[PDB]
Symmetry: D2
Subunit: 244 residues, 4 copies
């Protein structure tokens, strides 16, 4: 009975520092293999991104403390307002519930968008999740800038890579050697001149990723954007509730 419950004293809770912005980032586990197994289109599978986006928006609509979400590829980052008391700011609760939620929402929406690709039990969509604290909103701006810069680099690379492979019939291995050394202008030239692709004409979602933001009128409703957030300061300034 009560002779075993002392083992409860070995648990250690981690209460995240109060009045600090929390970022929760989730990223698909082994999604390179996952995207091969389910034959994702390359470089970008549109419906696969729409599954991520439905999952993230659904989560965000469940927790009014999530003010802003940014996603691309197999990742999503969620901004929690600094006065968030969700699960008393317990790190274990916030992170394992977020990876659990994204996982199950992903499975739900996958069966909707891909009815002909039923999930195999050895290839279920799993996510990790980590919480990071940022004490000042300038780090929050820089964080999302970090994630959008990364979206740019990876999409430009992948779009070039997969066009070398699919249009020029290169194998993945010869595509990589072709790109070693190349800078951004080079990849652009290769896409236009060799593959007949104008990179600037790629979908805004592929190039910029996806922003889900909570909108307030008399400072709520969820709106989705595919825009620059790195250099457009007015985008943030007209949204002061992201900071409060």
């Amino acid at each position: 009975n009560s002779k075993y419950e002392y083992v409860k004293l070995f648990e250690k809770e981690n209460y995240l520092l109060p009045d600090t912005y929390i970022i929760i980032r989730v990223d698909g586990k082994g999604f390179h293999k996952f995207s091969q197994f389910y034959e994702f289109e390359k470089p970008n599978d549109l419906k696969a991104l729409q599954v991520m986006n439905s999952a993230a928006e659904k989560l965000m609509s469940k927790y009014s403390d999530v003010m802003l979400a940014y996603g691309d590829s197999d990742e999503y980052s969620f901004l929690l307002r600094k006065n968030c008391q969700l699960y008393e700011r317990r790190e274990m609760k916030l992170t394992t519930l977020f990876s659990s939620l994204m996982s199950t929402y992903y499975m739900y929406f996958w069966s909707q968008y891909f009815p002909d690709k039923p999930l195999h039990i050895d290839h279920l969509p799993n996510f990790d999740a980590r919480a990071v604290l940022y004490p000042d909103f300038k780090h929050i701006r820089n964080y999302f800038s970090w994630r959008q810069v990364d979206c740019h680099i990876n999409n430009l690379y992948n779009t070039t890579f997969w066009n070398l492979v699919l249009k020029l019939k290169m194998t993945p291995q010869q595509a990589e050697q072709r790109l070693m050394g190349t800078v951004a202008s080079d990849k652009n030239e290769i896409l236009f001149k060799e593959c007949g692709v104008n990179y600037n004409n790629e979908s805004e979602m592929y190039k910029k990723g996806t922003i889900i933001v909570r909108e307030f009128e008399n400072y709520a409703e969820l709106k989705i954007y595919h825009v620059d957030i790195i250099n457009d300061d007015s985008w943030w300034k007209s949204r002061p509730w992201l900071k409060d």
Copy 2:
């Protein structure tokens, strides 16, 4: 890069080496979940079969899991003390387990309840926590703790719902009858007042579920519904749980 410094704000937790790790998952809002999908009360057999299939599948994927114990909407997994899965990072281990149990549950649900398709607002989610134990006797006491808790809670729920269904008590009147009572009292209340013999309840409901890796010439996963609190020989004949 001018933005990547933000990575330096991340803080990892590497769990103390050479210590046993328990990962415990527990269903999020499973009161509501069990009502929405019209689970049988006090215990739903097929729901438990879904948990057990999920846990067995996870365990068959991760050779570091030596033992699992489940009852109700929870499961505990023992990782061997020299486990190096994700370099023993707490963030990785716990979010992987909550993600794994969640999706395995969704997968197995559709096998066991083809007639109860999952609703977008009622998916099976789990939390997950890691606990360190520096000595195997604490691992023994840990699984004893969970099994005793299975007993206490199964007794409570079985008694409560039979007071309501057999004696036609209201929820408050049943709660009022149970105030103060200890386990032997609840067992007696069931027999004498509700006409239910608790000892005849299913062993799974009473004892919970143990999944253990069996080695012969010290592998196979075997499922048990047996006492592990007082049977020292059950543990003693399985030294690989310690090692």
Copy 3:
């Protein structure tokens, strides 16, 4: 080496970057300690001067310390938010501060109380804890918290010991006399029964002690681009600026904080 793996069991705690750090040290068993060396009651001036000398000395050695507040057997130190002392290691920051205050206290004690050599079973020990605050408004409220506490404990102790020393009550009956009492009552007890006006007590006893780094020609001149020899000059001025001591209200006087912008930066 076959034994050095044991180093891997150590766990460092690097305090979150860009946040204010408060270190609070507090004397271990200073009730018993102040009895053993027969401190004057309610306040021993020279014992407080020993604490203030220790804190001023520590602060003169570590330019990241921007502000210190003390009373009784405690001192709190504000580290600027971009402090990199020991790479923000919690273990290093706290045990250094408890060690420093302990040794500075023993040194200054032998200067101020040459006739009371310290006994080996009653050495002055301090704990020390680091606390993070993500916004400067929390730093203001933190120091308000400590100054409100200084007021409360000093009003109680002054009433208590005047009941004992002037009215010849035993400690326990003085304690019972004060059970239930609120602030105006303690004030009345002191005035009407003991002939002491609490408002006439020393500012140091009532308000505590503030040690602040003072800068003269300060502009928030710091940004990531400016570097090299400019930064060394900013660092040099922080070392060779003057520590001023105050016994003033810092709870409600915003202009005191407002005219000292380098505390936030």
Copy 4:
């Protein structure tokens, strides 16, 4: 008061995992410079080590949870029994108390051993202190082995270095360049063949360090949840009033030394 006390909620305590061995290691801050300022004898200053040993033994006689201590140079490691509840196993409390205790005990004993070299305010003996958890006693064995091997390595280097400088009248740079590359056996010969010094003739304390142990005579091992209340208190009494013995011996390779002291494991 009530509107400001919320700031208390930002504090984060670290409760060290129950029932695991705790090692607290303290090491003197900047004792290289400290040893030069007060003109420590080189390679080893006997009275300086005696100040450390007195400090450690006094601490150890004050805290019955400390079962074993090992010191050499400017460091000491203290072993806490597994069931130690000193300050509820709070890491902030355990560590800042130890760095504080060692610092003040050192200052105290220094004035006993060095009455003519009073401590200067810019050269006080300060210590850091860290707590480390070890879940199995074999790691405790290896920890103290680790520290004694380190003691051997540093004493041998320092003995060779200072004999080259002080006897052979070498400059610091060449003594240092002379030792680059050398292993223990090389150092042993430079001392013997070139300095006429037999390293084994050095004091055992310098070579082996200092072990301080709590000794029990009529010890039987039983430690359990069942025994409680005042029963725990006599075991506390036995532990508080037990003898501290000092040794300067190998503990790396001597299994019988440990096996005959089973109370260290509890």
